[PDB]
Structure formats: C-alpha cells, structure tokens
Amino acid sequence: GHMSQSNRELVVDFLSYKLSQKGYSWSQFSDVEESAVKQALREAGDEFELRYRRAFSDLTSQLHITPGTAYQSFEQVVNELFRDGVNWGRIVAFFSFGGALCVESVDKEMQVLVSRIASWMATYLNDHLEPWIQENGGWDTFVDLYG
C-alpha cells in the first residue's frame, strides 16, 4: 500500500543520501529508483553520526560481518535495540546503523549487502516501527521535534 511504499522510499532516500555523502551512488547497488520528513531524517542521521561516528567506526569487524552472517546479525541487533520499547532517538540510531553498515559493506567488498540491508530496514520499519510511529504523532511529529 501507499504506507509500506512510502517507508521503503524513505529508506532509499536516507541510504542514497548517506551513500552519496561518502562518494558512492545508490544506482551502483540497486535499480530501485525534499519532503520535510526525508530532510529531517537525513539531518538527524548526520547529527547522530557527528556525535558517535568514532565509536561506531568499525561495525563489520565488531560484528564479524560476512555475506553469510549479515542477515541474522542485523536482525539480532535491531531486535535487541527495540526489545523493550521505541523512541525517536532509537529510530535515528537504527537508521544511522543501517546507513553506516551499508557504507562499510561496500568499502569492504560486500556491496551485495546494500540492497539486502535496505530491504531489511524497510521491512522492520513497516512491520515493527510503523505502529509506534503512527501512535506517537507520525513522522510529522518527528519533523516537529528533529526537523
């Protein structure tokens, strides 16, 4: 539906932004082709990175990421992150995490992971974050708070 599609598009926008910010291009990894929401998310993401990038500088080594272990590892991290609840900050961390994982993957010859991560992010957002989001003011409220 329009809802699921918009969340998938939001993920593409954020990751494309993040990937391009690092000298990469979305088209290099996927054939899948500014609203205030997208703008606010890109901005929150940058802010989170400017604050914690260094501590999250080597995700693939810390998690021992390989094409064969990425699937389960990603899911375990996101499940633990939201195991007891959700807030906008954790959602931003979720995005930054996914974005950082995408960049590192291509930098470390695992570009095949970009499309998968994008889908994993969008699927988790739609199935396990959307409910909290719509019950907490929706993305519009996120824009008002982090805009």
């Binding site: 929150a44 802010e47 989170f48 604050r51 914690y52 501590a55 999250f56 995700l59 810390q62 998690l63 590892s73 375990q76 991290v77 996101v78 499940n79 633990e80 992150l81 807030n87 906008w88 900050g89 954790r90 959602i91 931003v92 961390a93 979720f94 995490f97 708070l145 982090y146």
Partner: peptide, 19 residues
Amino acid sequence: XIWIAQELRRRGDSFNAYY
C-alpha cells in the same frame, strides 16, 4: 550483536533526550 544494540540504545536514548 547484543553489545552493539545496547550502544545504540544508550546513545539513541541520549540523542532522544537532547531533542
């Protein structure tokens, strides 16, 4: 991941409080 997820929780929570 557990360790990474918990770093994201504490930092996401710190980030949340700031805004």
